[PDB]
Enzyme design. Sequence first.
Site, PDB file in Angstrom:
ATOM      1  N   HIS A   4       7.912  38.396 -61.593  1.00  0.00           N
ATOM      2  CA  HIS A   4       7.009  38.550 -60.520  1.00  0.00           C
ATOM      3  C   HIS A   4       6.627  39.993 -60.208  1.00  0.00           C
ATOM      4  CE1 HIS A   4       5.522  36.909 -56.647  1.00  0.00           C
ATOM      5  NE2 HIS A   4       5.604  38.243 -56.295  1.00  0.00           N
TER       6      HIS A   4
ATOM      7  N   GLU B 259       2.919  41.777 -60.822  1.00  0.00           N
ATOM      8  CA  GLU B 259       2.295  42.482 -59.846  1.00  0.00           C
ATOM      9  C   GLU B 259       2.038  43.987 -60.184  1.00  0.00           C
ATOM     10  OE1 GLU B 259       0.965  40.907 -57.285  1.00  0.00           O
ATOM     11  OE2 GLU B 259       0.200  42.949 -56.866  1.00  0.00           O
TER      12      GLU B 259
ATOM     13  N   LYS C 165      -0.855  44.079 -62.896  1.00  0.00           N
ATOM     14  CA  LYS C 165      -2.084  44.052 -62.299  1.00  0.00           C
ATOM     15  C   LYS C 165      -2.864  45.127 -61.657  1.00  0.00           C
ATOM     16  CE  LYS C 165      -1.276  40.214 -59.898  1.00  0.00           C
ATOM     17  NZ  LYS C 165      -1.453  39.288 -58.972  1.00  0.00           N
ATOM     18  N   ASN C 166      -1.849  45.811 -61.013  1.00  0.00           N
ATOM     19  CA  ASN C 166      -2.391  47.059 -60.270  1.00  0.00           C
ATOM     20  C   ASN C 166      -2.799  48.071 -61.326  1.00  0.00           C
ATOM     21  OD1 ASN C 166      -1.992  45.786 -57.768  1.00  0.00           O
ATOM     22  ND2 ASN C 166       0.214  46.562 -57.356  1.00  0.00           N
TER      23      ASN C 166
END
Lengths: 342, 342
Positions: free
Chosen positions: B227, B231, B234-235
Site C-alpha cells: 500500500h 501510493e 503513483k505519485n
Amino acid sequence: GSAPKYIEHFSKFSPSPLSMKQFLDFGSSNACEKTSFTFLRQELPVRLANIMKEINLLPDRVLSTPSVQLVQSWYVQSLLDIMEFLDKDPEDHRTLSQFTDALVTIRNRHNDVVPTMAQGVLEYKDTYGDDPVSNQNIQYFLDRFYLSRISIRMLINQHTLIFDGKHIGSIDPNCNVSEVVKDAYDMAKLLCDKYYMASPDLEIQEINAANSKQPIHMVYVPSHLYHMLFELFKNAMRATVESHESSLILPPIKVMVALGEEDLSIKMSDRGGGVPLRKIERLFSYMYSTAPGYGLPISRLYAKYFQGDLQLFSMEGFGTDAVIYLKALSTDSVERLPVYNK
Amino acid sequence: GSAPKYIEHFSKFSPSPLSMKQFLDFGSSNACEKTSFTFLRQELPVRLANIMKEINLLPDRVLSTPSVQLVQSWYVQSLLDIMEFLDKDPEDHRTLSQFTDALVTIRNRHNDVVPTMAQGVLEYKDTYGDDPVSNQNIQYFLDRFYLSRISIRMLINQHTLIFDGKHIGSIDPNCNVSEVVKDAYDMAKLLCDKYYMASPDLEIQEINAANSKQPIHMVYVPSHLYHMLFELFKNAMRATVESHESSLILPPIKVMVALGEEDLSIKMSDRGGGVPLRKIERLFSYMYSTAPGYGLPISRLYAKYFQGDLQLFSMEGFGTDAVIYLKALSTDSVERLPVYNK
Ligand SMILES: CC(C)[C@@]1(O)c2ccccc2-c2ncccc21
Ligand SMILES: CC(C)[C@@]1(O)c2ccccc2-c2ncccc21
C-alpha cells in the site's frame, strides 16, 4: 539601577523582522548612517529586552546558575550601552561615530556565548538529569536564544561593515552558491587530510530549472551559508573516511544545487554508512548531543533565520543526505524572530 | 441500551500493543484458536471503546455531523457484537466458529470508512472554514482514529486467516522487499500506461550492509508495504510523466533497499520536477489535501504502525525522494497504539 526598568519597557515592543530586500536596499547607495542609527537605537533594545525577559521566565534552578547569570550580565551591560544613545543628537557626526564603536564592543563582548551555553547544558544534565521534559525546555529556549543572537549580530554587522568610513555589508547580491560550496569543502578537506590522511572528492551538479545554462546565483549572507556547508562537510567526511577504513575505495561527496521557482535547495550526499533513524532525530538536540558539538542545531538555525530549513535523512548501512532549503527570492527571505508572548 | 455503559468500562483499560514476534509465534504451530478467542473478546472491546470515548470528546459541531454519527453507529454495533461472546464457553467449537464469522461481519461493516471521513472533512471546511487550529484537531484525531482502525483490522485479519478450517496470516516471515517493490511498481505502471500512454522504468538497488550477497528479507505485513509503495509509485510516476510532456527522455524511478543493523530503509527517487518545501509539509494534512487524496497520510500511518516512518524531501526543479523507514528486527516492530488519557 534601571536595568529591570528598561527590560519591561522595550519587551512590550515586538521585534520588527526585516526582509533580505530591505537589507539590500537600505545598505545600497541610499544608505544614510543617521537613519540606520535612529532605527537601531530603538530596535536593538527591543530585541535585547524580549530575550532578556524570556530568560527571567526560566526556573530559578537554571536562572541562578553561573552560566546563565554570566550571559544575562552581558545582555544587561549591552542594553545599557545602547541606552546612552537614546537622547543623543543624530545630526552630530560624533554621535554616529561613537555608536558604531559601541556596537563593535557589544559584538566582541558576546563572542564566547556558544561554549558558555554548552557548559550550562552539561551542568544541567549532571545536576537535574536528562529527562525528555527537560530536553524540550532546553531545546525550545536555546533555539530562540541563538536565533535572537543571530538576528542581533546581523543588524550590527550590516551597520559596522557599511559605514566603515559589490557586497552590501555581509550580503552578496550575486552569491554564487557553488563557489561557497567549494570553499567549505576545501576547508573541510584540509582538516580531513591532516587528521585522517585521506579525504573524499567533491562532485557538484547544478539544476537551474528556469535557465538550464545560467549559473545559480542568489542574494544571501555567504558567511551563514559557509557555516552550514562547512558543518555538513565535516560530518560527511568523518563518516565517509571512518566507515571505509578497512576498504580502499573512498566514495566522493555529491552536492546538488537546485534552483526552483521558490526554493534554492542544496543536497549533500555521502556514503558514510548512514545513521539509524532513532539517532538522527537526536542529532539536533542540544541536551542529547552534549558530552563531558552543536554544529547541526546551530546550522539549522542559520537556515531557518531567513525562512529556510536544514533536514537530514539517512539510510543505515549506506549513507546520509543533508539538504539546505533556502528561499530563492529576496522578498521571501524575511527574518524569523522569536517574540515574547504570554 | 447499554452502549455508553460498555464504552466507559473498557475505556479504562489500556490497549495491549503486540510485537511482530508475538504475532508470528502466536500464529505458528502452537496456534490455539481458544486462546486467541479469549484474548480478542477482551482486547477488541478495549480498543473499540478507547477510540469511541475519544470520539465523544470531539465538539458537538463535529459529533453531530452525519458522517461522524454514521461511523459512531458502526463502532457501537461492532462493540455489541463482541459483547455477546463474553459469557460464552471457549471450550465449545460452535462458540469459536460464530466468533470468526462475527469478526468478518465487523470487518466488512467498516469497509467504507476512508471515503466517509473524507466527506466529513470536506463538510467541515465548507461549514466552519480551514483555519490552522482546526487542521491540528482534525489531523490529530484522524491519525489516531485511522491508526486505531489499522490495529483492529490487523487483529481480525490474523484470527480469520489463521483459523480458516509459510505465511502466518497476513505476515510473511521471509518477505522479499524487492519483490513487493516490483509488484507495486507493476501495478502503478499498468495504470500509468493506460492514462498517460507512457511510464518510467524501474531501477532497484539493494544494500545489505552485514551480508553484501544475501537478498534482503524481513518479517512484515506485505499488504501494508504494498500500500505504501503503490501510493509512492503513483505519485512519482504522475510527476515524472507530467513534468516531461514537452521532453522526450523519461527519467526512471530509482529505488534503494538498505538493510542496516536497526533499520530497513526504502528510498524512491524520481525526477518529476520536485515540489517546493512549503507544499511538501501540507501533503500529509487531511484538511489541506481535500478538494470538492489521503494516500500519503494513510501510507505514513501504516509505516508508523510498527514503529516506522515515511518521510518526503523534495528539490523544486529536479525531483523528490520518498523514504519508508521500517524496523529491521521483529522484536522492535511493536504496535503503535493511541491510548485515551486525561
Ligand atoms: C537595515 C538595517 C539593519 C539598517 O540599520 C542599516 C544597515 C546598513 C546600512 C543601512 C541601514 C539602514 N537604513 C535605514 C534603516 C535601517 C538600516
Ligand atoms: C496474536 C493475536 C492477534 C491472536 O488473537 C492470534 C491471531 C492468530 C493466531 C493466533 C493468535 C493468538 N494466540 C494467542 C493469543 C492471542 C492471539
